[PDB]
mmCIF file of C-alpha atoms and ligand atoms in Angstrom:
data_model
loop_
_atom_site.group_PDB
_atom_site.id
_atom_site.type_symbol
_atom_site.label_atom_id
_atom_site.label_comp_id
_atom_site.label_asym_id
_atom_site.label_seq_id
_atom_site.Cartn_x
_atom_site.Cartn_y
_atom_site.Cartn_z
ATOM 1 C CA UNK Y 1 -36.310 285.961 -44.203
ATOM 2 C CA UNK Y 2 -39.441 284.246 -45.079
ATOM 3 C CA UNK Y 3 -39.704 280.391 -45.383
ATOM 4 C CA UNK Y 4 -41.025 279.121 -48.341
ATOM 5 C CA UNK Y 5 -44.907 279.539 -47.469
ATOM 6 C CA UNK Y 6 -47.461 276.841 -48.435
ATOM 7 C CA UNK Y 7 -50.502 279.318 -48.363
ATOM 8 C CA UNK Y 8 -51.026 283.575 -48.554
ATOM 9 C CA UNK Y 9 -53.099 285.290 -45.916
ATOM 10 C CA UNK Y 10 -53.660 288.771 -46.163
ATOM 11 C CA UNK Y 11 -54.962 290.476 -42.837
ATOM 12 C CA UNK Y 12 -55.694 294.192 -42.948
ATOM 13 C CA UNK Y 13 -56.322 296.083 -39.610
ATOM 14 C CA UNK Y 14 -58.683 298.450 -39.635
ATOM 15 C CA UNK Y 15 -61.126 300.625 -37.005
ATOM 16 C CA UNK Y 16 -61.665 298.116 -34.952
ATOM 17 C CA UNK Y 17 -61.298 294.193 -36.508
ATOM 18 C CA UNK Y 18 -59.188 292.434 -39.105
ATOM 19 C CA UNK Y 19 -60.354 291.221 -42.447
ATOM 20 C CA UNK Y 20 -58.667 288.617 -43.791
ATOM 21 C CA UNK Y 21 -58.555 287.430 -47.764
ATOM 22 C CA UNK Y 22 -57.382 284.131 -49.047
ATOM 23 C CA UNK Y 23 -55.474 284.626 -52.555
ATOM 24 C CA UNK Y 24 -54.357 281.134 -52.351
ATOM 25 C CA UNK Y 25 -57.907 279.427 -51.888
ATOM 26 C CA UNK Y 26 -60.140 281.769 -54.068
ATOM 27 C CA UNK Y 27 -59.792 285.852 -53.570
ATOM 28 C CA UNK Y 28 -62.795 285.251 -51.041
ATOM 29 C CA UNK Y 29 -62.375 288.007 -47.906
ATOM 30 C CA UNK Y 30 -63.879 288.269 -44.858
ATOM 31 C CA UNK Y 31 -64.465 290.378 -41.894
ATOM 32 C CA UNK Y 32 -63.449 289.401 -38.132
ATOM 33 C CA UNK Y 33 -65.900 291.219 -35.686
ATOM 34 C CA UNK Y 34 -65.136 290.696 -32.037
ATOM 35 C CA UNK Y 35 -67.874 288.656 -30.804
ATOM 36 C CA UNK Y 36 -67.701 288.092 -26.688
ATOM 37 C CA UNK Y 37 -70.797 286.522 -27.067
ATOM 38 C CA UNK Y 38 -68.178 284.524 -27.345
ATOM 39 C CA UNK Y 39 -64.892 283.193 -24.647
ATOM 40 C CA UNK Y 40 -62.043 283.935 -24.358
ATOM 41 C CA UNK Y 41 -63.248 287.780 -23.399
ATOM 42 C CA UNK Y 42 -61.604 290.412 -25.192
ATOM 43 C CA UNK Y 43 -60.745 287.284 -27.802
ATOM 44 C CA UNK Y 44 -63.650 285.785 -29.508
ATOM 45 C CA UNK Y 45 -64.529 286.800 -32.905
ATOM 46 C CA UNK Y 46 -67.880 285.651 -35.302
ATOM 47 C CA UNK Y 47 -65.006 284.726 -38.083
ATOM 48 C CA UNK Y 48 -61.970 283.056 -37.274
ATOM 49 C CA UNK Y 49 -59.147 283.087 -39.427
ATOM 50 C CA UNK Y 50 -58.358 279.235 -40.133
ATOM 51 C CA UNK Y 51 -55.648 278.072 -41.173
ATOM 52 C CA UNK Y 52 -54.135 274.489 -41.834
ATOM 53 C CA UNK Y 53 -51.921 272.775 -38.976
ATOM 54 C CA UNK Y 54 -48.541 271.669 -40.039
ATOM 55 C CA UNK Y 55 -47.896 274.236 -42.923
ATOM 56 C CA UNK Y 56 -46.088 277.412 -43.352
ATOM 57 C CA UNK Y 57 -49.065 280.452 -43.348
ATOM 58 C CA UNK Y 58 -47.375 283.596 -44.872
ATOM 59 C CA UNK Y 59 -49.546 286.490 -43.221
ATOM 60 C CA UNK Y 60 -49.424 289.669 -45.598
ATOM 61 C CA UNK Y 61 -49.911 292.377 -42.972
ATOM 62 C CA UNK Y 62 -51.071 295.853 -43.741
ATOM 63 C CA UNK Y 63 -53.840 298.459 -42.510
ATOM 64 C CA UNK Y 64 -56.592 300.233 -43.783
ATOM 65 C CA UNK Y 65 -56.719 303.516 -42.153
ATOM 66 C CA UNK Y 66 -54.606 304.271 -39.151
ATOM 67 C CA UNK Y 67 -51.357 302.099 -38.450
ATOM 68 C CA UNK Y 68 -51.968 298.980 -36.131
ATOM 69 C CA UNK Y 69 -49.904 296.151 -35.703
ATOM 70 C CA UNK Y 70 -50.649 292.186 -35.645
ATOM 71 C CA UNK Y 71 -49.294 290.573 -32.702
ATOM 72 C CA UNK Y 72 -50.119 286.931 -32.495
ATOM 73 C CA UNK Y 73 -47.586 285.607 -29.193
ATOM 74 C CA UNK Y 74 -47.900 281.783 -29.371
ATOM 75 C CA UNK Y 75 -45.882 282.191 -32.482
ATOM 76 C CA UNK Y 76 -43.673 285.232 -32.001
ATOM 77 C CA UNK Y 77 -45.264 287.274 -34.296
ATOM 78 C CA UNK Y 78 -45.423 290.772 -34.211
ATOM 79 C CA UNK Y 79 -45.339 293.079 -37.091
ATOM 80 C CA UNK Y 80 -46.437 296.783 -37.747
ATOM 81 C CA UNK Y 81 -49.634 297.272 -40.184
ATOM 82 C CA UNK Y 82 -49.282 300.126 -41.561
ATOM 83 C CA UNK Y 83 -51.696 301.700 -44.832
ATOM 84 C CA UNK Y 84 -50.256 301.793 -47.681
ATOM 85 C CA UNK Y 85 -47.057 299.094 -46.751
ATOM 86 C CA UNK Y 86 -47.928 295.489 -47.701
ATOM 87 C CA UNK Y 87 -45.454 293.613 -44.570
ATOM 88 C CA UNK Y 88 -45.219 290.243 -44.412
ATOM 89 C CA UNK Y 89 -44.165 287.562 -41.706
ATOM 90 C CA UNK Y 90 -45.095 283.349 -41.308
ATOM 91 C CA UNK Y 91 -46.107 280.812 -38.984
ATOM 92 C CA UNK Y 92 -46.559 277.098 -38.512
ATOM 93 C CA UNK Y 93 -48.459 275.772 -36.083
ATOM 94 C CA UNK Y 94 -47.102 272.399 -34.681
ATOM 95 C CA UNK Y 95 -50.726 271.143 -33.564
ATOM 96 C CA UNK Y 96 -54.537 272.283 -34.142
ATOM 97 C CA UNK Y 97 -56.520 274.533 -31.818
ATOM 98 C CA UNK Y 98 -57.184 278.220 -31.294
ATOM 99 C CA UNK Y 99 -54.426 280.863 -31.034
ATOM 100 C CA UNK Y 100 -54.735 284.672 -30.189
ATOM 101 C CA UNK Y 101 -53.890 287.506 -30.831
ATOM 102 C CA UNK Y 102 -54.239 291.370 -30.083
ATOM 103 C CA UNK Y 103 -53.308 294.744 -32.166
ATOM 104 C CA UNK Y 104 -50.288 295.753 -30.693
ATOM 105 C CA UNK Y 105 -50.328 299.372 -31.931
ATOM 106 C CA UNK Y 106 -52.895 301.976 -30.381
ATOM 107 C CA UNK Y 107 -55.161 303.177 -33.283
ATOM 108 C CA UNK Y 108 -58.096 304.835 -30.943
ATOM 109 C CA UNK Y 109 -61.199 303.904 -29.064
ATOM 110 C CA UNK Y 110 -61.715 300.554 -30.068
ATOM 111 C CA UNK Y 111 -57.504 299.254 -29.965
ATOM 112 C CA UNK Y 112 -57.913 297.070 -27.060
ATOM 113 C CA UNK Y 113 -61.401 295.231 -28.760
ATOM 114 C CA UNK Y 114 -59.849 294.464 -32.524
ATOM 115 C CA UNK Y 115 -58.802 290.664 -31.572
ATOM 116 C CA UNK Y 116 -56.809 288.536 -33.738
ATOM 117 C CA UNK Y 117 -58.342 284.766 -33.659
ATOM 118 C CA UNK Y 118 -56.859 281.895 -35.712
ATOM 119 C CA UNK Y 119 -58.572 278.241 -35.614
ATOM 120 C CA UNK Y 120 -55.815 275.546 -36.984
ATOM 121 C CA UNK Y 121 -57.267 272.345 -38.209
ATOM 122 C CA UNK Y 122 -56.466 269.329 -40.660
ATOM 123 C CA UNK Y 123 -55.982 269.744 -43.907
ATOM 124 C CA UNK Y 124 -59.576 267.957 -44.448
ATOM 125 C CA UNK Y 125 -61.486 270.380 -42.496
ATOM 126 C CA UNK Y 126 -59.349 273.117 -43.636
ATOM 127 C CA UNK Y 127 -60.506 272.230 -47.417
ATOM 128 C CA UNK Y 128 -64.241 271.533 -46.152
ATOM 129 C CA UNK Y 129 -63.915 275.108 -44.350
ATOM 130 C CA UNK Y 130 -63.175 276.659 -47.450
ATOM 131 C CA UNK Y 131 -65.766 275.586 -49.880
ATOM 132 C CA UNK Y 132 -68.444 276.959 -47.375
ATOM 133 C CA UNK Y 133 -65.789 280.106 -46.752
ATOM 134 C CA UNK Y 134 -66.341 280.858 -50.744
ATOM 135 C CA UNK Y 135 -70.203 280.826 -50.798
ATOM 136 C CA UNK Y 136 -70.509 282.832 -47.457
ATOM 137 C CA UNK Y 137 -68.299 285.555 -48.090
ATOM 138 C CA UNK Y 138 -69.992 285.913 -51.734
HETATM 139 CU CU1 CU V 1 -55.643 298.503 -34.068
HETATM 140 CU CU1 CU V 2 -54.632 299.113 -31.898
#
């Protein structure tokens, strides 16, 4: 079953990133590139999905294309993503930081390079991240 959720993400795997949209703070959406520019390698992404500490994150999980799956391991998460089925499964993080993530269904060339990377903050930067989340992502 899932708990009572204080917020909706949906994350949709696709050829070869998430995008994540935020029903509950707007409709805004957003791709997540891997970046590695960026550390950890194989982790690092230009867009995180963030997320506020201390609340329960319902993650609506489906894919765009070919079936992947969302596999986040700090959490014991791990749920097929499959087009066409809208799945769903939750977390709450206890404290802030970064948490990762990897498709955990091979989907091609690119499977081992489509990281999943959440950033948990307060709920004042997690508002603050927001407002600037609307205007970038349009
Ligand atoms: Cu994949
Ligand atoms: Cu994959």
């Amino acid at each position: 079953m899932v708990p009572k959720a204080d917020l909706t993400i949906k994350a949709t795997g696709k050829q070869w990133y998430w995008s994540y949209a935020y029903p509950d703070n707007g409709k805004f959406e957003f791709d997540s590139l891997m970046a590695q520019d960026k550390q950890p390698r194989l982790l690092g992404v230009d867009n995180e999905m963030v997320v506020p500490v201390n609340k329960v994150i319902r993650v609506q999980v489906t894919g765009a294309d070919v079936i992947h799956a969302f596999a986040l391991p700090a959490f014991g998460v791990k749920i097929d993503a499959i087009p066409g089925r809208l799945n769903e499964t939750w977390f709450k993080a206890a404290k802030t930081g970064m948490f990762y993530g990897q498709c955990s269904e091979l989907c091609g060339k690119d499977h081992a390079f489509m990281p999943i990377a959440i950033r948990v903050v307060e709920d004042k930067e997690f508002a603050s991240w927001v407002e600037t989340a609307k205007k970038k992502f349009a």
